[PDB]
Paper text:
Delta-1-pyrroline-5-carboxylate synthase (P5CS) is a key enzyme in proline biosynthesis pathway. This enzyme catalyses a two-step reaction that converts glutamate to l-glutamate-5-phosphate (G5P) and then to l-glutamate-5-semialdehyde. l-Glutamate-5-semialdehyde will spontaneously cyclize and reach equilibrium with delta-1-pyrroline-5-carboxylate (P5C). As a bifunctional enzyme, P5CS has two structural domains: the glutamate kinase (GK) domain and the glutamyl phosphate reductase (GPR) domain. Our results show that Arabidopsis thaliana P5CS1 (AtP5CS1) and P5CS2 (AtP5CS2) can form enzymatic filaments in a substrate-sensitive manner.
After obtaining active protein, we prepared cryo-samples of mixed-state AtP5CS1. Similar to the AtP5CS2 filament, the AtP5CS1 filament is composed of tetramers serving as the basic helical unit. Adjacent helical units interact through assembly interfaces comprising hooks. Differing from the AtP5CS2 filament, the adjacent helical units in the AtP5CS1 filament do not assemble in a completely perpendicular manner. The helical twist is slightly smaller, approximately 80°. In the resolved density map of AtP5CS1, stable density for the GK region was obtained. According to our model, the GPR domain of AtP5CS1 is positioned closer to GK. In the model of AtP5CS1, the substrate ATP has been captured. Similar to the ADP binding in AtP5CS2, the adenine group is stabilized by the ATP binding loop of AtP5CS1, and the triphosphate group interacts with the conserved functional amino acids K20, D177 and K242. We identified a small density located near the RGP binding amino acids S60, A62 and D157, implying that this could be the density of the substrate glutamate.
Numbering used by the authors:
A (entry chain G), B (entry chain F), C (entry chain B), D (entry chain H): 5 to 162, 169 to 228, 238 to 286
E (entry chain E), F (entry chain D), G (entry chain C), H (entry chain A): 72 to 86
Write the structure that this text describes.
Amino acid sequence: DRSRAFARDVKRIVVKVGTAVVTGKGGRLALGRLGALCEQLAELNSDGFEVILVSSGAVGLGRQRLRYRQLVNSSFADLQKPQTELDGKACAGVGQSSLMAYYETMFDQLDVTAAQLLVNDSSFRDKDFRKQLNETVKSMLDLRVIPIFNENDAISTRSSGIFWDNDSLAALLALELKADLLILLSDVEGLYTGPPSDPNSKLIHTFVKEKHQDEITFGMTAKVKAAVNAAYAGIPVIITSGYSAENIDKVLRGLRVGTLFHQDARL
Amino acid sequence: DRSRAFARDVKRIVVKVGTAVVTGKGGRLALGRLGALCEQLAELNSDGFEVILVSSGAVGLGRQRLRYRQLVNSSFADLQKPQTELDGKACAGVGQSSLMAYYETMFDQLDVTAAQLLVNDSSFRDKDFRKQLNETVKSMLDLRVIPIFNENDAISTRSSGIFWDNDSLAALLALELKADLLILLSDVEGLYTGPPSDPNSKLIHTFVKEKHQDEITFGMTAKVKAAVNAAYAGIPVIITSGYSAENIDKVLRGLRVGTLFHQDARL
Amino acid sequence: DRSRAFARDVKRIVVKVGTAVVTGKGGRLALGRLGALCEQLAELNSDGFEVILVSSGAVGLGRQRLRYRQLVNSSFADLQKPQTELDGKACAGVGQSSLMAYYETMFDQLDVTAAQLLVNDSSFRDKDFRKQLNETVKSMLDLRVIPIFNENDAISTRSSGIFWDNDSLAALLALELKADLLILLSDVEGLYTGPPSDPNSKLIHTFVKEKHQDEITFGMTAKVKAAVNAAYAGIPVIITSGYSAENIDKVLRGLRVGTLFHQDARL
Amino acid sequence: DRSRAFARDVKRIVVKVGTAVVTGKGGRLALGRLGALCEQLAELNSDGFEVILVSSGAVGLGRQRLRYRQLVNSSFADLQKPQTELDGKACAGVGQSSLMAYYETMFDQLDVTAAQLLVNDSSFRDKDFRKQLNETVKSMLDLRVIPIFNENDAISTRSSGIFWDNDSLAALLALELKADLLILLSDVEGLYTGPPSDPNSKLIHTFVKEKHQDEITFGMTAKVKAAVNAAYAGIPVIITSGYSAENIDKVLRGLRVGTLFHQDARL
Amino acid sequence: YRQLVNSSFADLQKP
Amino acid sequence: YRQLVNSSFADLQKP
Amino acid sequence: YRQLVNSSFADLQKP
Amino acid sequence: YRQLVNSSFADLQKP
Ligand SMILES: Nc1ncnc2c1ncn2[C@@H]1O[C@H](COP(=O)(O)OP(=O)(O)OP(=O)(O)O)[C@@H](O)[C@H]1O
Ligand SMILES: Nc1ncnc2c1ncn2[C@@H]1O[C@H](COP(=O)(O)OP(=O)(O)OP(=O)(O)O)[C@@H](O)[C@H]1O
Ligand SMILES: Nc1ncnc2c1ncn2[C@@H]1O[C@H](COP(=O)(O)OP(=O)(O)OP(=O)(O)O)[C@@H](O)[C@H]1O
Ligand SMILES: Nc1ncnc2c1ncn2[C@@H]1O[C@H](COP(=O)(O)OP(=O)(O)OP(=O)(O)O)[C@@H](O)[C@H]1O
């Protein structure tokens, strides 16, 4: 439109992928969605953008793999007994490795080098750590590498910290790395006036902190809170659906797509 | 022999792979050596052992990949100008992802699930962190998963800490996880009475803290220091060459292979 | 509709993928499209269908890879001289291996075993060969395997034969294997009353050999000829666009999608 | 020695890998052996040689995979009933795709482009086919590509033909492609004066058609017959053990390794 | 028991 | 029966 | 000449 | 200059 004109000076993008975008039916990987996303990110990176990817959704794939392992090495007599709940940290550790190995496979097939950085909550308490991370990211972006961040859930001792979920980790990274636009890839077209299943609900062209502030009932509430916190500091935030392969290009070209969170746009 | 009789009650093994074992000629991956090692580890894990792998050697592969990227996207005129030194943290971050993606590929091809855990020096300062890592590792080993540890060099702010290198990280993990035998995979057959190139040098059947204490001149000195620290606390340590595919089986069967670091054996 | 009611007793499907569906921009693989197609085929195969895939589009990927190789091992002075045209058979041979390795990678990641069969024109001249191939395909389908046929372009001595292109190889296989529905995955929504770029053109609900026989003007003419030949013998043929991930489900459910080629439907 | 001096003008090498070299314990892939072989072949190809690889051993891996599939999708009640023998052609078709996908994976990781050509017995009956294949192989070798031949067992209607096994397919290719040395990678160090298990047996430095001709009792008899047929026409043949990673370099450097089949050397 | 006896490995891999 | 009842999936994956 | 001298490897990888 | 002009991409990929 006219209020999405900042999509022309955008140089660094922090793209966060949701769990509903990574894991498909049955808990396995969604190969089509992730492949289209990786193709779009490689095209953006070849174009001249500096793309930072904050991956998410390792707990689900990890749990699927660990259930497979239990079955394969389990025995009938046992399958007749009750089941147990698979540890959370074990699932996260198993899923992270598979997800990032798959990311490396497709990025290599796309002729793009991808790098894996893992940052915990206790690490962010040091300003010197922030400076190091900034220097490392700058050096990796100067060679056209896509840093794939995440949260070290497989070692976390864990809300009271700086960040508690990837919805907020993306905002913290975008604020720290001085990004220019933050895209929260979810499974919904954006932010609605009510529940998505409600027919009376309507899409939000842009979020207003004086009108749409208290007009929506909510998960997505954490996404909205992180978006408001990020857009308050001067980082425009776009909530868009990752089910489509051209949404990133549409928002980066200035089209009316997704929900916009901007401090200057809101009046 | 007779003093390597503890290789029968061994149940948990902490295997550390060196940089000279992972990276082959040209800085690329050594596919033959790593493939043989992965085959042996899968056979051990299927046998009934609980194998913990402490990988190493991501800085070299990472630097090779980053030099490739610089060239591919570099331009002639530039190749005519002087070169620069690639950041250390960028190289480590790029190399780690590729190494562990390759590990996942071969372990999947071997029908074994491998898990990636990353632990930094600042994390070990918390006893509660030690308890949570122990619980996670126990839960992952109860499902026949090979936890592939490493050091988060791609985020490490960095000798004054608990551990400073993987030679000592392996010892710290073995002491904390209550392992039963620690194998330091290097490129040399063990510990010699002098430099390996010296013809007069002889292999050390077992390390004695009263005789071979100062009979050796030295890298490998860090390996020996970590081995002495680990074997002091009651964890037997074996330094063996990873160039062969059956060395792990030989040491685990009680044969005379490698250099032994034992507190009870030494007199 | 009412004339697509045969999509309920369909048990065997012969799916042919076009070149415009496999190769994306720059001659590289289209990862999103092929990933969505592989996900859909794995879902169909798990559902209870017997899916036969007749792949295509190795010449393009092969040529891209061979140009990469020429450059990488080529030298400046040479790049200053004129270029040459890369052999056709060399390109086909290089591309086939990469395409089918990628197919195996995604099918393994999808927990489906895929098999590669290659059949040439000279082989089809033997009736005993037809019986052998039928027996092999039956044995492979009884174990829930997806036979990935193709044409041995890398050994072909080469129109006068039984089949000359994959558009006709799919029809020959469907007739020989007694399939029940043949889907020709192309990049267009189907068959139009004229050129697709013509605004006055309209989609064809079903092809009539007494009306649309000569009305349509035209590549796609080979597709239409193969479709008419297949549908004459009693194998219903559907021409549908592979750019969407749910077109196969839509045609298999009886919805109005694509262009239909049926001998009984046409009047 | 002195009679292995022809290893200096060697320019094209036809390397045949046995079944005992590809498939490891349990019918799965031998990752260490194949990785070392691929590393050696990539080093040779980078050196300046023109390496042709005639792969073998898809029936075993294929049968393992098909048994896995039967079990996974089989059901207890059924496992209680008798088993069946898995078709030969289905096993070959499934195994070939996996083997060559793995070959592509390691060759890509080694920065070498590998190409897959499949040739049947009926195809060799045409001289024009021989010319076509020679032209294709020349064009593929001029771009530093490793053509990975095999036998189309998944389509073969099938001894009365030109070739019946890969031991003889390698000889036929070496004679047709005008190779300079043929290496038959087996699991034994070469040709012995008797059974390998016999302690009195001794290794044969070179095969003599007037002495060793009837001094050996025997599988390996097919290997010896193919070697004699190839070496009669003027192609030196070396039978060497593929269990070691440096045997190819040793024979190509002129060292005394393996068993030699030469028409000029024999007196 | 019967649900497991008359079941297959892939059926179990599901919830 | 018992060999199968008191067996595991990976044991079967072997001859 | 100049087009090649002031060019990069990835630019060439394209037609 | 000459070392680069009369060189290939893979030669550079080495120290
Ligand atoms: N008003 C609302 N509008 C849209 N979505 C809503 C709303 N209220 C709840 N939701 C839910 O919030 C979900 C947000 O998606 P998702 O599960 O990826 O969120 P998340 O908690 O940010 O994810 P992740 O675990 O990847 O960080 C939607 O899929 C939808 O089901
Ligand atoms: N007396 C000695 N005996 C054996 N090796 C020695 C000796 N002195 C020095 N070395 C060197 O120490 C090296 C130890 O191998 P390596 O490079 O893997 O060590 P590291 O510093 O522990 O490795 P990493 O970086 O993987 O932790 C040997 O390769 C050898 O060159
Ligand atoms: N009337 C028409 N309607 C639709 N497409 C047409 C028409 N005339 C020509 N075409 C062209 O035919 C093409 C058919 O697609 P495609 O290139 O895959 O065909 P193909 O020759 O069957 O492919 P392949 O090489 O994979 O066998 C369309 O992409 C379109 O550009
Ligand atoms: N006198 C002998 N010397 C050596 N090996 C012998 C002898 N007699 C029989 N053999 C057997 O021949 C085998 C040859 O190996 P291999 O199984 O690869 O043969 P092949 O039939 O040529 O293989 P492939 O199926 O790969 O073509 C040896 O492993 C050995 O067991």
